[PDB]
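Request from the bench team (R.T.):
"We need a structural guess for the complex before ordering more chloride ion. Sequence and SMILES attached. Just send the tokens back."

Command: build protein-chloride ion structure.
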Amino acid sequence: GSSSVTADLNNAVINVDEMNEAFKDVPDLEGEGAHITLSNTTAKPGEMAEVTMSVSNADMQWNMCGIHIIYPDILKPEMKDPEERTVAFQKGDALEAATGIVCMEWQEGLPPVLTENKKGCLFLTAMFSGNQGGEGDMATFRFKVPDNAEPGAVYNLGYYYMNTDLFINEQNIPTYQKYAFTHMEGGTITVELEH
Ligand SMILES: [Cl-]
Ligand SMILES: [Cl-]
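Reply to R.T.: structure attached below.
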């Protein structure tokens, strides 16, 4: 079908098959649909590189999210309180109206698909009063690009799907959630070439 082949071609969700399985009994939304995306940027070796998650076609259409962002574990996210595993972030316009936002680094008890592929993970949850979710930039993070990073190196940024993760409206419409998760796009940090 369209939307689960859509998710295979975006290669954004590491456990996409598991996800498609989870959604197998939910028909496709007809038609569109929130578009969640990560950024594609260039950085120098050793740089604190900015990464931004954003969403389009969602203004006033959603109520909360709980999303797992993944990245190569050699990248280290900038931290607010290491002791609490809070990740520093700049909130964008899409989250302007949020009643609460939390963002944490998943450090311990990561699932095999992530550990075995040397992926790190953070979890972003935001809640709104009714359907006041916005659009545009959601959150901007920073990652330490290793000092010794090779020019041209590409760090893929994506998602991990957990059964309880969310991108939903107040009414909890299953097709809405399916669209969002099956159409999400990953991102990249590319290390600049030598001068
Ligand atoms: Cl990754
Ligand atoms: Cl930041």
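Two things stood out. The chain has one domain: 1-195. The two ends are 46 Å apart (CA to CA).
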